[PDB]
Glycosyl transferase family 8 (Anaerococcus prevotii), 465 residues
Amino acid sequence: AMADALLLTLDENYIPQMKVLMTSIYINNPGRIFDVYLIHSRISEDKLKDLGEDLKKFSYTLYPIRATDPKEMYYRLLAGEFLPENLGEILYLDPDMLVINPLDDLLRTDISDYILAAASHYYNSGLLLINLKRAREEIDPDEIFSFVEDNQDILNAMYGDRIYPLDDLIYNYDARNYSSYLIRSKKQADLAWLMDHTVVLHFCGRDKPWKKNHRNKFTSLYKHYMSLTKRYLA
Amino acid sequence: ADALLLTLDENYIPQMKVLMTSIYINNPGRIFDVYLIHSRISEDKLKDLGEDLKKFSYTLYPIRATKEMYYRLLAGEFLPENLGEILYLDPDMLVINPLDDLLRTDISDYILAAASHDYYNSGLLLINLKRAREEIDPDEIFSFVLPDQDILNAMYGDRIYPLDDLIYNYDARNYSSYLIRSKKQADLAWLMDHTVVLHFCGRDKPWKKNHRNKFTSLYKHYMSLTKRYLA
């Protein structure tokens, strides 16, 4: 293992956002190499070729895996069934995120005794550091389908006692909620502190920063990474 | 390579490193010679700064003037005679797009290029040192002497190639006025695709605690990047 592994589960409408995410990872983790596994259902071979050629500019390697026949929900949870059997660990990321600090601390988290690590907002499923050795033995597919057929809620309800808790302020910061975090941190978590400590910004909900009317403290930053992405992956 | 000029003392070095980091990220693969006119930064700080710049493959060339409003106007006097052109930048700036188009501007016929608004700001100057050396007498400037952008406009307005401030000297305090003045074309999406230089003018500086506008997160992110890239 000379490359850390990343997992994304999306289809082609989120590719633009995935490229911004990749660019933010590259700028904030200089010299690190990633293998990027992409579970998808319908992305064309030409688009995957394009995306692969782009990632290679950062010395990242794309490993597309086509699922067959809430689609994306399942891919994440059943990652251990799609990924190679000799991979021990992988970092799942939602595409509507921006990495703004090095991932080294996260990637060195000792999760040897857990299924995964996730941030609590219950756990959010937008970032998951997955121990695949344990997911393959503990997470059984039909078990998951039984649960969904009767009813992430799956993640919390079935595997809540097997999760290593991460701080959302650092690893899954809900970019809508600057004030709540500021108040809850006793005013410690202002922009200066966030830019030094927060690793992952998550643009949750309908108000996405690639759209025309986005307006908060983080909009300029996200639009700047959008420009960086167009220039770096030209 | 291309040449950059800064004129500052010790206390502005941290901002200069942030500017250099922004140039590095937004101009990948480009190399610069970086000239620094200063009154008395210590040898140890100059050594530290030169070592840091080498991490970007920039080369630092300190020049001790044996204050700073003059230095930029009399750059012809301080800089080597074999240098024909240089880009002067204030350290309270951030470069957020490639400098290529600026650096290729043909200013053969002018003393310098500067951004207007027909008043000129002297925080960014692309200087034709050949003509500056022919046409700028220190004697004239000294007797002549409001900021120093008064000297620039008074004495040389005719010999200036105009740049658009929206692209090359964007007053970061004034998002809304630019937005109104551009008929709502210059929103953040547009700025991030076209603006090259953000200028954090006035006393509310983005490295201070209470800075609060649309650009704060961006500048603070470059501060964090600078500390990591130059560690």
